[PDB]
Each structure stands twice: as structure tokens, then as C-alpha cells.
Design a binder for this molecule. Structure first.
Ligand code: O0E
Length: 227
């Protein structure tokens, strides 16, 4: 099936991504605390709900939160400032907090149930967010022997997410806090975010040889993100 794209709200970042984030893929954003990962997640959760000629997919959202960082009022602000009803936008986001990494893995299985229900409705699930993908794995799997065990469990979690993306035509968007590399990763596309000067955020594609090699620049605003 043909893939869909979701505009991020920034034309610069959209060009870096070839039009937006893709369905049938996992896009991982990574960078230090404060680099804009969660604001990009909030913006995408609104953008995907727009019609396709405005860069959305007329889609619903599912959001797994490991750090209590989802903010419904920020959704409402972004929606209002993009011409959308804030409470309708919120109603098409299903939200769950993952208590630990094993609960996080179970929540991906639960998510399939709602995905199936909405699949042939006018707003099927088109975006599944995991913010943060790695935080519980990093606190639970630590010390001698933990590198191999943690990487194996992560890879299985990511395989479950790839299955949902590919089987149900969903964009999976995940965040990863990284304090300034040797570990393997299995996301489809990895985007490094960082702070720039003048309040700007800078994005670069990592290990993607046949895609754009420049950098996108964006700001965080009342519309979420924009150039
Ligand atoms: C934006 C937010 N929207 C809600 O609160 C809307 C209102 C109506 C129910 N909503 C939910 O999110 C419900 C709350 C709930 C939990 N158990 C029973 N009901 N989510 C779920 O059911 C759920 C979500 C998942 C997300 C990802 C993965 C697996 C999930 C599995 C789940 N069971 C808001 N602030 O208004």
C-alpha cells in the first residue's frame, strides 16, 4: 500500500524528511533534554488530524507516555492556532502512561485492539507516539550483562512497533534522550535534534546516505513548530 506522510509544521524539516514523517516506518528523534523532541510529538499529534491537502492524514493518534510529559492544554493551543477545534483534536488522541518497560510492551499489544476498531472509520489511527522509547529500559537494565539483555528487549519492542506500522499503515514516532553512539538501533529513520542559536532547533538525518545531507532549522511557537 502507498505510504502517507505527515507534515511536521516546519517546511524546512518537511524537506529534510521528503515531505514529512512516513507511515509504514518508525521515525526516531534523539537528542539532549530540551532539544524539542516532545514538542515535535505534540505538533505531529495535531498535524496528522488535518486533511491530506493540508499535510495530514485525517487520522487518529495513540500516545504512550513514559515520563508524564504529555500536556493536553498544549495540544489544545496548537490546534486552536492551526484553525482546529481543540476539544475535537483531543478526542482523537488515545493516551496511556507506561508504568515500566513490561507494561510499555503490553500497551503496544493493547494498541492493536483500538487500531482494529478504527481501521475502516473516517479517522483510522495514523500516528502512534512512544515518548520516551528508552527511559524505562535504561533504568531497569543496568550493570554487567545489561547491554545485551536491554538491546534484545528493545529490539523486540521495536519489532512489535514495526509490525503495527506496516500492517495497519501507521506512522510510528519515538523519542530517545541521548547525552552527547556505539549501540545498535532498529528504527527506520533516525533524526538528531539539538538546540541552535536564537532559540532555533536544528535537525540532521543520521546514517541515511541516499537522503538529504543538509540540516533543517525550526522554532517552537504557539503553532507547535514552524520555520
Ligand atoms: C488525550 C486524552 N484522551 C483521553 O483521555 C481519552 C478520552 C476517552 C478515553 N481516552 C483515553 O485516552 C483512554 C483512557 C483509558 C485508559 N484505560 C481506560 N481508559 N486510553 C485508552 O483507553 C488507551 C490508550 C492507549 C494508548 C496507547 C497505547 C495503548 C492504549 C491503551 C488504552 N487502553 C485527553 N487528555 O483527553
Amino acid at each position: 500500500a502507498t505510504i502517507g506522510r505527515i507534515s511536521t509544521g516546519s517546511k524546512s524539516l518537511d524537506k529534510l524528511l521528503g515531505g514529512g514523517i512516513e507511515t509504514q516506518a518508525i521515525t526516531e528523534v534523539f537528542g539532549e533534554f530540551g532539544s524539542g523532541k516532545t514538542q515535535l510529538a505534540h505538533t505531529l499529534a495535531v498535524m496528522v488530524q488535518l486533511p491530506p491537502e493540508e499535510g495530514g492524514l485525517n487520522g487518529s493518534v495513540m500516545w504512550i507516555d513514559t515520563e508524564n510529559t504529555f500536556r493536553p492544554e498544549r495540544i489544545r493551543e496548537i490546534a486552536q492556532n492551526r484553525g482546529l477545534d481543540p476539544d475535537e483534536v483531543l478526542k482523537h488522541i488515545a493516551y496511556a502512561r507506561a508504568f515500566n518497560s513490561n507494561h510499555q510492551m503490553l500497551l503496544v499489544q493493547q494498541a492493536e485492539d483500538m487500531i482494529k476498531e478504527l481501521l475502516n472509520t473516517d479517522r483510522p489511527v495514523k500516528l502512534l507516539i512512544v515518548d520516551s522509547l528508552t527511559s524505562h529500559f535504561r533504568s531497569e537494565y543496568i550493570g554487567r550483562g545489561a547491554l545485551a539483555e536491554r538491546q534484545q528487549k528493545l529490539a523486540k519492542h521495536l519489532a512489535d512497533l514495526h509490525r503495527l506500522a506496516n500492517l495497519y499503515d501507521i506512522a510510528v514516532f519515538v523519542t530517545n534522550q541521548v547525552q552527547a553512539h556505539i549501540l545498535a538501533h532498529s528504527a527506520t529513520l533516525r533524526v538528531y535534534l539539538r538546540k541552535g542559536k536564537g532559540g532555533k532547533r536544528i535537525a540532521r538525518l543520521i546514517d541515511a546516505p541516499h537522503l538529504p545531507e543538509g540540516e533543517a532549522v525550526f522554532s517552537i511557537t504557539e503553532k507547535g513548530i514552524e520555520d
